[model samples]
Target: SVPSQKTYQGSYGFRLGFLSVACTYSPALNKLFCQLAKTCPVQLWVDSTPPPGTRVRAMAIYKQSQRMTEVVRRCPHHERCSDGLAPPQHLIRVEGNLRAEYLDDRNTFRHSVVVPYEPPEVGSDCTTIHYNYMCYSSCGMNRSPILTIITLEDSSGNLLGRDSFEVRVCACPGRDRRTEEENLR
Candidate 1:
């Protein structure tokens, strides 16, 4: 398990363009808190709670890429073609799909998970944006954990950016039997 100091310290932990993005998770809260902001236009925070018996994995992105445009006169699926080339939305869109994997001590994967995005109401027309997600183990029993990779893309399906964060799972030692009984009863 990692100590408090081991986690991300402050704004200095992120990139220059993303000074507003702060990633943190709390054991007592059982949720991850991310404080996000942009120069003067976009500012918001996202809270992510992992499934029961699992830990949370999180990352952030901001003001990091060019706008994306839709292709006009597009070809059918499984085929490639370009024609329309429509204009991109002036608003910053925060959404992406998630892929997760569980690993054993030997670094061998026990299973893999693919999570789709069910977005909430994110605003539009902003120079910067921030979003968060809660990534949990498939079954909540896997012990050895490794990494979580997050891919952030624009509304046009353009690959805007990507980020990866570490995951550490810890076992919580319970209180004494008498103390527990007194609290519960």
Candidate 2:
């Protein structure tokens, strides 16, 4: 019989005043093999407070860096010590434009645009505009966790209210990738 593979899943919630948001994700990491999955799911839930006409949007920023150890063998000598051409540690930074939107009938600024990678200051009507902002990263380095900040804005781009939520990824030695429920337990 084939060995069974383990899987994981979990959800996170946040609240600030009348604003609240929830997120669910399934992450996988091999502690024994020291490997991480290429991508993971990030489900978002924004509470309905600013009425149906208000627009809501979400974006993501992902950054990754890693150094891999490779094995190489020289010609003629069947034996090999430890000298191989390993690619340098590369850094990848990416920004995603808002994935969710709620448009107003006037075609002007009814809600806000959630810029993916960059952050637009509050009340600035230049380039950045959005009702909610979320910053997420799968990399388990540092104390960085999936963090999302959402704001309730008026038609004129004024900050009406705000809230945030965060979930930390599990990365420890031993066992296969586990869900938030298993890790937390």
Candidate 3:
């Protein structure tokens, strides 16, 4: 069984009402978010009066992220670690690009195209594997749980795209108020 918590540095400005590690604004990103949330709950700090369309879009992303994580967890490790020849992760930093690693062809799976897929049984080999992003959005300015990953599309443009996930409420740790179910007021 996996542990019950995770960790990630929140943005520097957003006051984190809740503590979480990974933040995002996309459903796919949310998959990673949930995995992160499993260990660390996701945070959501948005304007109290965000436009209705924007709010709807945000919620959609949040739900998508949740679904994505569940699918990955249930699925097998398609891409596993392979030969030790893979270069260290020191490539160009492409912010807000989903599947950025794949798009960047400089480092393929093996050759000019790709690398060998390793299996888990060998301890370490060339196998297709899964990688969850740290956070989707390039929101480095916020440390609050409210911030989420940025979608492949820009969330700041006039055409608001419902592509990012959102946390409805912040998760409070160590503040569980347990009352007898029968002791309802």
Candidate 4:
């Protein structure tokens, strides 16, 4: 079946966009996280817990192109066409220059780390997750085995967004098991 771009709502990281992490078995997120787990020493800081999702919201600051309406209209599915014809909310904008930063309290017990990721670029394609960077850690300190939940802040370093994820300092990583029997749909 074809991806229903008609249902797009112009959001990022899932639900309304190409990388629909809202799904129970998110292929894009799965591959991304799995790749990170393999390359980096990451553990599910919590007991086999799934990290809560993150939401990114943006406002239109400016429009650079002329004849943007024609550009959006020419697309195969133009429901949330914000390129030139609609408002900023109509587009899922992630230019190559998009920036993300970390907030206060650098990891002391745990090493400060960030894993860069990007979703698939083409429409109606398998939303492959690409891990651009992973666990920017240098094994200089002998930190203890620990697990913790922490919030990641994005947006001009003002913490405009809120999201919590698990991290671990142990050698062994935790397991993530979610069965239909455990989940009540």
Candidate 5:
């Protein structure tokens, strides 16, 4: 009879690093398409791994702070600001714990959602109906990041790492016609 092979332990190494994007984002994306989904979708990937059974979980959030906003002038102005959006302000948070059992499958995070949303709920100044900016006017027209934060911890809840991502909400550019045009033309 052959000898039975017993699996050993203590070989898994530590994966250290903060959160980052999986794909190389190009500035020339289709803003026209983003128009349909009404959301600027982004793929978030994990760059590191924790010890086995550590059950690493991540929290994704967008905090509205030092945001720039202006009052909605009126009829003509309202329509002109086509990229206008609401402040979301829902504590803007999401969490992921499904990766606890995930192995070296290090390609991307299970949760691929970035903070970009719009809600025509109400105006910042309720006193005036359509005369002022709407409830979610933290609208910076992609001028600045939406303030995203990612933090990691074990199942029992101890700190591992924390990081921030630069996510913006606005009209994304279309395909890289210019890049091709530069030489191919």
Candidate 6:
């Protein structure tokens, strides 16, 4: 057993599954909106089989190349280009760290901290993390349905797992900036 052939190993069942987009719902109408001045949550289901008392404390980060076009489709005539027209997007490549753009002095992201609040998301079985969306005028490229690609902590020693989740940030183009979720599913 001097020289083993298995140079590296791979693990499974360790991932971040998207649960739902918990947006700042309007108290008056009880509906989530794409309007600013509100924060949202990127609910995720984390299933990791790490050793008990594992110190691999994980956190989610925003994609550096977050060109919302990846999540937003081209503006069409029928989908309300008549009102909330698509704004021209100017993409930039972050030469350093993408997280810096989100205005986190210590380290904030497009969404707030991955574990914004409760520890109830964790259990012996299923575990989840709620990443709050704290907009910094980062993904406001257009009124189309925006997409935010959140990444889990990576580039670590004893690396076991890393995953990502896609979230839909709605934007209303037909009427006011108060994105109406009249048909959102």
Q: Which predicted model would earn the best TM-score?
A: 6
Model 2 TM-score, all chains together: 0.28
Residue lDDT tens for model 4, 15-123: 2211211112222222111111132211111112123333232211111133111211112233322323122222122222234222122332111222232333455
The reply for model 6, stretches above 4 Å from the true place, is 1-12, 20-48, 52-125, 136-159, 171-185
Q: Find the number of clashing residue pairs for candidate 1.
A: 3
**TM-scores, in order shown?**
0.23, 0.28, 0.19, 0.24, 0.30, 0.34
Instruction: Give the range where candidate 5 is weakest over 10 consecutive residues by summed lDDT.
Output: 125-134
Who is ahead in lDDT, 1 or 2?
2
Over 81-134, each residue of candidate 3 has an lDDT whose tens digit, in order, gives 122232222111223223233222233221111112112225422112222322
In candidate 6, what are the lDDT values of residues 1-185, reduced to their tens digit? 01111112235344433222234433333323432222343233344344432222222222234442132222233232111111222111111122322212233122212222122233524444333322322243342323333333333334444443323334431242244444442
RMSD of 6: 13.5
The RMSD of every model to the true structure, in order and in angstroms, is: 18.2, 18.3, 18.3, 20.2, 18.7, 13.5
**Between candidates 3 and 4, which one is better according to TM-score?**
4
Evaluate model 1: give its lDDT: 0.25
Local distance difference test, per candidate? 0.25, 0.26, 0.23, 0.22, 0.26, 0.30
Better model by lDDT, 3 or 6? 6
- Model 5 spans with C-alpha error above 4 angstroms: 1-48, 51-88, 91-144, 173-185
Q: What is the lDDT of residue 162 in candidate 2?
A: 42
lDDT computed for candidate 6: 0.30
Candidate 6 residue-pair clash tally: 2
Q: Candidate 5, residues 130-160: lDDT per residue as tens digits?
A: 1111112224222332333333444554544
lDDT score of residue 12 within candidate 4: 29
